[PDB]
Enzyme design. Structure first.
Site, PDB file in Angstrom:
ATOM      1  N   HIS B  43       5.492   6.936  -5.377  1.00  0.00           N
ATOM      2  CA  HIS B  43       4.315   7.062  -6.238  1.00  0.00           C
ATOM      3  C   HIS B  43       3.162   7.817  -5.563  1.00  0.00           C
ATOM      4  CE1 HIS B  43       3.017   3.011  -4.441  1.00  0.00           C
ATOM      5  NE2 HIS B  43       1.878   3.679  -4.409  1.00  0.00           N
ATOM      6  N   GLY B 148      -4.312   1.176  -0.402  1.00  0.00           N
ATOM      7  CA  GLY B 148      -4.071   2.069   0.721  1.00  0.00           C
ATOM      8  C   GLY B 148      -2.995   1.605   1.683  1.00  0.00           C
ATOM      9  N   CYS B 150       0.202   0.860   0.905  1.00  0.00           N
ATOM     10  CA  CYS B 150       1.581   1.188   0.561  1.00  0.00           C
ATOM     11  C   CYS B 150       2.217   2.079   1.624  1.00  0.00           C
ATOM     12  CB  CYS B 150       1.639   1.846  -0.809  1.00  0.00           C
ATOM     13  SG  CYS B 150       1.435   0.622  -2.126  1.00  0.00           S
TER      14      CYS B 150
END
Ligand SMILES: *[C@H](O)[C@H](C[C@@H]1CCNC1=O)NC(=O)[C@H](CC(C)C)NC(=O)OC[C@H]1CCC(=O)N1CC1CCCCC1
Ligand SMILES: *[C@H](O)[C@H](C[C@@H]1CCNC1=O)NC(=O)[C@H](CC(C)C)NC(=O)OC[C@H]1CCC(=O)N1CC1CCCCC1
Lengths: 306, 306
Positions: B43, B148, B150
Site C-alpha cells: 500500500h 508510519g 508499516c
C-alpha cells in the site's frame, strides 16, 4: 436437476513436470524440483526404527550431499546431483546442479481454512492422480494418500502462476491428512513424528455454506430464501456456539449476492434454520449443509467468472 | 515473590541493520533489506485518497523502478537504486543494486497462535522501539504502532538464524494489529484496504496458561494444584465451550511437568476451576489467567534452559 458443480482441480501438467523421487538410503519419497532446488519432507532422513522420536538436527549433520539421490522418471528422465543440503522446518531444501528446464512461473503461499487447492498425488516420483480439497478449520484435509505419497504437492493458480501451498506429510487417526507449507511449517499444531497426535475439532465453513446456497439459487432452488435476515455480527456470535466458523465476506460472495439479488444476511438466517434440520426437504440433492465449495468455485463453474 | 518473568525480546541489532525507508511518490513507510531484495507493504503505492479500494495490479503496472526511493539511515547511510519491482500478495519485492552487507543468516516462517515473537517498531526507516507479542488465536497482535510504522518487522531466532515472520500492515477497530507473512499473505482474514473489517473472536491460549501456572509452581505458589486431573481430550471439549484454544502438548511443556512434578492434566483441571473465579486469591500477583507467556519463556527465564 444437476447443479453444474463438480470437484474441479487445476490442470496438473505444469506441476507433473516438477515431480521427482528423492532417496536417502532405505528411505524414499517424492520431491518438488524448481529452479536449482528440490523440496521434500525431512523424514526421508529418518531410519524406520526412529520415526517415533527423531533428532532431525543430528540426522541432517550426519548426511552429506552424496547421501541423496534425486531422480526424474517421467518425461525426459534425469538424475540430479545434489550440491547442497539444508533444513527449513519440516522440509529439506536440496540444491542440485541442473535448473529444472520446465520450471513454471511460481510462488509459495499458505492456504487458509475454507480455501480450496489442487493436489497432485505421487508415488516414487510418478504422478498418479489429482483431486481438490478445502483446508479444514482444524488444518487437516480430507485427502486420499497412501504409504509413499509424502512429498505430494498442493497448489493454487493465479493466471499462469502456480502458488505452491502444501506438501504432504501424514495421515491422522481420524483418516484426514496434513502437511507442510513451503516455509517448512506444518499446517496446524502437528509434528512430523510417528506418534499419536491431539487432533482439533472441525467446524462448518460458513462462507462456503453461503456459496453453496447461492449455487442453489443460481439453479432455481430457493425454497429456503425468506425475507428474514441475520446480521453478520449476530450470525458470528451464533457461529461460536454452533460449530461454525465466523463469516467474513469477500468480493466473490458479493458478486453472488448481486447476481441473485439475495442478500448475504438472508442466507445467514437460512443457515441458522437449516442447521436445526432440513425438515424432509433437500437442497441440490443434499439433506445437510455443504461447505466444500468456495465462492470462487460457484462464480467460476456456474457464472464463468474468474 | 517476583517470578522472574518479564516480556523479553531478542537483541534487535541484527534486524536494525536491515531496516530501510521506502518512499513511493508522497507515500512512505519502512522496508526490510536482505541480500538484493527490499520487502515492504504494497500500500506504499496507493495515494491516500484511494486506500479504500486500491487496484494493486494496475498500480504496480503504472510504476517503474524510478518510482521507488529506498534509503538506509542507520550507520553508514545509503540511497539504494531500485533495479526491479514485483508484488507478492500484500508485499512488494523491490530488487536493489546493492546487497545488504549486514544481511544476517535468515529464513522466512509463519508464526502460529500462542507463539511469541519480537517486533522492531520503526518510523521513516529508523528503529524506535522493540517489544514482544504472542500471536492471538484470532490472528491479531496486541502491539504498539502509530501512523508510519508499516513495514516494521517481527521475527523469532534459532541460534544465530533470524526467522522473519511478520511485516506490519494495519490497526483494527479494537486497537489490535495485524500484518503479513513474507509469503505475502495477511495473518487472519484481513485485506490491505482502508475498509472496516470483521475481526474474529479472541480466545485464551491454553498452552500459555499452562506455562504460566507452571511458572507459579516453580515460584512456590501452588495452592491451586489438586490430585484431580482433566484429560487433554476432555479439556479440549470444555475449551470449545469456554473460549479457550484446544491444548496441544509440546516437549517444552513436558520439561515443565518433569521439573515441577505436576502433570499437565492437573493444570487442565485447575484452569477449569480458576476460570470460574480465583476466590479472592492471587496467582503470581494476578486475579486472572495470564496467557502472554509461553512454555519456552518459562523454561528459559526461570529454569535457564534454551
Ligand atoms: C509418507 O508417505 C506417509 C504418508 C502417510 C502414510 C499413510 N497415509 C499417509 O498419508 N507419512 C507417514 O507415514 C507419517 C510419518 C511421520 C514421521 C510424519 N506418519 C503417518 O502418517 O502416521 C500414520 C498414521 C496412521 C494413523 C495414525 O494415527 N498415524 C500415526 C500413528 C501410527 C501408529 C503409531 C503411532 C503413530
Ligand atoms: C501503516 O503505517 C499503517 C499503520 C497503522 C496506522 C494506525 N496504526 C497502525 O498500526 N496502516 C494503516 O493505516 C492501514 C492501511 C490499510 C491500507 C491497510 N489502515 C489502518 O490502520 O486504518 C486505520 C485504522 C484505525 C482503526 C480502524 O478501524 N482503522 C481502519 C482499518 C481497520 C482494519 C482494516 C483496514 C482499515
Amino acid at each position: 436437476h444437476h447443479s453444474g458443480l463438480v470437484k474441479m482441480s487445476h490442470p496438473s501438467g505444469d506441476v507433473e513436470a516438477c515431480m521427482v523421487q528423492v532417496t536417502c538410503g532405505s528411505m524414499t519419497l517424492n520431491g518438488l524440483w524448481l529452479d536449482n532446488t528440490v523440496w521434500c519432507p525431512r523424514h526421508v532422513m529418518c531410519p524406520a526404527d526412529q520415526l517415533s522420536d527423531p533428532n532431525y538436527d543430528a540426522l541432517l549433520i550426519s548426511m552429506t550431499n552424496h547421501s541423496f539421490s534425486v531422480q526424474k522418471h517421467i518425461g525426459a528422465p534425469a538424475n540430479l546431483r545434489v550440491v547442497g543440503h539444508a533444513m527449513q522446518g519440516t522440509l529439506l531444501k536440496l540444491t542440485v546442479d541442473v535448473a529444472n528446464p520446465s520450471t513454471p512461473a511460481y510462488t509459495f503461499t499458505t492456504v487458509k481454512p475454507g480455501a480450496a487447492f489442487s493436489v497432485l498425488a505421487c508415488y516414487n516420483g510418478r504422478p498418479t492422480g489429482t483431486f481438490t480439497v478445502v483446508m479444514r478449520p482444524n488444518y487437516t484435509i480430507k485427502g486420499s494418500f497412501l504409504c509413499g505419497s509424502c512429498g505430494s504437492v498442493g497448489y493454487t493458480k493465479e493466471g499462469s502462476v502456480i502458488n505452491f501451498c502444501y506438501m504432504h506429510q501424514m495421515e491422522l487417526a481420524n483418516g484426514t491428512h496434513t502437511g507442510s507449507a513451503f516455509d517448512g511449517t506444518m499446517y496446524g499444531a502437528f509434528m512430523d513424528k510417528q506418534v499419536h497426535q491431539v487432533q482439533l475439532t472441525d467446524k462448518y465453513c460458513s462462507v462456503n455454506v453461503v456459496a453453496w446456497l447461492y449455487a442453489a439459487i443460481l439453479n432455481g432452488c430457493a425454497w429456503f430464501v425468506k425475507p428474514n435476515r441475520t446480521s453478520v455480527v449476530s450470525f458470528n456470535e451464533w457461529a461460536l456456539a454452533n460449530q461454525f466458523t465466523e463469516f467474513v465476506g469477500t468480493q466473490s460472495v458479493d458478486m453472488l449476492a448481486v447476481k441473485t439479488g439475495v442478500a448475504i444476511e438472508q442466507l445467514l438466517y437460512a443457515i441458522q434454520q437449516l442447521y436445526t434440520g432440513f425438515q424432509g426437504k433437500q437442497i441440490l440433492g443434499s439433506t445437510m449443509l455443504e461447505d466444500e465449495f468456495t465462492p470462487e468455485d460457484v462464480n467460476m463453474q456456474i457464472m464463468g467468472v474468474v
